[PDB]
Symmetry: D3
């Protein structure tokens, strides 16, 4: 099942992301249920917004907020919910939310899957417009949700991204 | 796997539906295989018709005809086959088919997923046109299928819907 | 899970195919991981080409190249990745690739799923244009992939298709 | 604009059809306004049905109901509304409704657009499923429209189709 | 062509709207060029948002900003760009931006196109979610455009909507 | 109509392209009829390929093959057939086929439509993958057409592109 995917062939440089929400999809927020492995509807989003990249998580990781590390993966075409993609982390979007700090990684497809992202080694190599669309989306997609808000602190580099993965993987085994 | 989803957090008011066929999809009739949990093609439908709502079943229930209770769920956007949605039962469409009585529940998304259906508490609160499209679809979608026919008896209320769930859940454990 | 589907109700006349890539989809090459049962991205294809039929494999078979037998299934509408369809083998496309001989079966939906393919009993009954599009696709879809090439030897009949299934099923149990 | 398209290169054997409604689309009935040439929404269909082929009309023709001759055209992929395709007539579906006699022609793409329809010379050459689906669709698509009914009388051959085109083309000059 | 469509059968109660951008589409801002009547790409939107309803304009109207009156029209399924739909005005959204006062009307499909909107007579009859989504969308869609801002002032009723249509239709003759 | 669109705001640096075939669409070759201005189906493509960018033409230009200059235009999302987009020429693909020399221009969206293409000034600035996909597509899309062949000669720069536009625009007046 999806519950049995490895975090990575060679963490933290080489990771697998389980995709929950495709890029440019209808505003349905899917999540994988950690008990069954099944795709569940978490909610229907109320803003007219879509994820600018595919979104999901790295399995067998536990971040400080209790869930697996979440990741945005740009792809040339949207992926299926439930599918697993081999990626390399490239940066981290840091936010503070109603429950305090949040981080969302950005990871690009592994060169085995595509050469299109070989030149993106770090957070400065992502297109500016994509980064602005990512930040704008996380600032506004919960606007019409009562008692929730998000605010962006800014981007950090591939090394900071890798540290969050390691820290949350090691955390997942004992805790 | 999908075989391990609960019937409901709090049956029969608060149930999960496993979606087999999305609303307004191509005419492929999917079903979840009760042995593997996999999505199987049951058939390619022969009429030019589509399901007016998403269609699936409540797991761990056994109706009188031998299969789990089947349910129609209206959503603002079509869901993925295989996905699980939290719903509240609101009514029941009663039919008599070649093997005698059939019932199909209608359930709307739980208010945790969406507020759009909060005002629909019972079968009279569904839009008339949706109900007519549901009845018309079940009357005609097997028309070009040899030795099959369906005829609608009419709508019953949320309490009748809930009784079918309870009866078919309790039936599933001993039988 | 998908790992537990049977090869067939009555091999080799009556088989199940697990679909990995839908017909006329975006150029993402999915594959089912044999460890988890999950859908993985194998790669993003680099040519502007799509599979002319749905593509997947018969489970519990092992061909000479180490993977399950792969199959093309024409359907009236594209199927979902992950779904399982009941088929009858009708022919085989024989190729020689960089690692030598390759065979890809063609199988049509079982008459229980559709009557549309009842008249196709053998490889000569497939439309010429479909067969030419299949051959052309396998000749060119790896063109922009370094160190890979394919060349078509030609079509064989339903009996040859069935022999490959039997041989690869029997091979899968001891080997 | 679309008001100036010819009826055909060589009536009645070689015609153009102006497509108003694609096969397999959402239940929106488009029509070309004969004053502007623009695509108008005539209505949203109220049954959960879709047209089994593309649908539109031959320009510069006037049938006895006052409207241009309407044509159903199967294609390998749905066409865009407003596009014009070159076709050959093969058949006619005769019907009666609450306004009188109706007839819909069936036309396949001209061999310069595709060779896929070259074996289709007459009405008995169309796939049986397709004929059944077209008839079923006209008998039921207006079922939830108060006061409307459709009775299908039977199929007529290519010669009959051709006669109708000539008649309605001569009738359009003439008036 | 689209330049010759009328403003309405019976202004201001019964209007036509020329649709430029479908609900829920890719982030492409189309507009009709008033010289050619052709669909032009005005820009690719830079936020990850989509229009919550179809959007376009009433022909032969001139508002004080120099452009035809623009209208938002909800429908059961997205419309094609360039298509013309018959509608009734129900409301107006008033706004201010970096060029002045703006107003966008809201119109629902005419009862001859669908009875689904018959209970919607005025602005307080629109679903609250839909009103909130429309307002949120105008306040944020230009956020990544340097120098542009949008402030939403509030909703006005059907009478106000109707007044604007009459004013801008008389203003278009007149000039 | 589409026959009256200008060639460009400021030829040859700032042009309009009339889009006939969207990127990544079904294998339908549309063209604008120069007599009506309407979209005609020229053919259904017989290979399982799709255009890697949007494709169309610059109006009021005549190339030596007798047809308007054709242009490939990459965009973030596929455009509608019949829509007109403002672009800057960056390159030319030269080819030979069974009728002579061909050339296809490459143009990117004008900076008023998107800043995403501002770093693309010349042919060596296009992504290598995209150039390879375009060349591969012209060499193979007509492979199953008897008597047709395409040989790709190489890329030429923006200056060469610009020269072709001026030449063919002057040649269209002139004749």
């Amino acid at each position: 099942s999806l519950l049995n995917v490895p975090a990575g062939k060679d963490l933290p440089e080489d990771i697998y992301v389980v995709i929950e929400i495709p890029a440019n999809a209808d505003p349905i927020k899917y999540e994988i249920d950690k008990e069954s492995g099944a795709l569940f509807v978490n909610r229907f989003m109320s803003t007219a917004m879509f994820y600018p990249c595919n979104y999901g998580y790295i399995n067998h990781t536990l971040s400080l907020d209790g869930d697996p590390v979440d990741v945005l993966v740009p792809t040339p075409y949207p992926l299926q919910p439930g599918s697993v993609i081999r990626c390399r982390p490239v940066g981290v979007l840091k936010m503070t939310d109603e429950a305090g700090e949040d981080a969302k990684l950005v990871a690009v497809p592994h060169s085995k899957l595509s050469k299109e992202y070989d030149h993106i080694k770090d957070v400065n190599d992502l297109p500016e417009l994509l980064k602005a669309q990512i930040a704008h989306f996380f600032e506004h997609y919960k606007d019409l949700e009562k008692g929730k808000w998000v605010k962006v602190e800014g981007w950090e580099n591939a090394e900071a991204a890798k540290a969050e993965i390691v820290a949350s993987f090691e955390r997942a085994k004992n805790k």
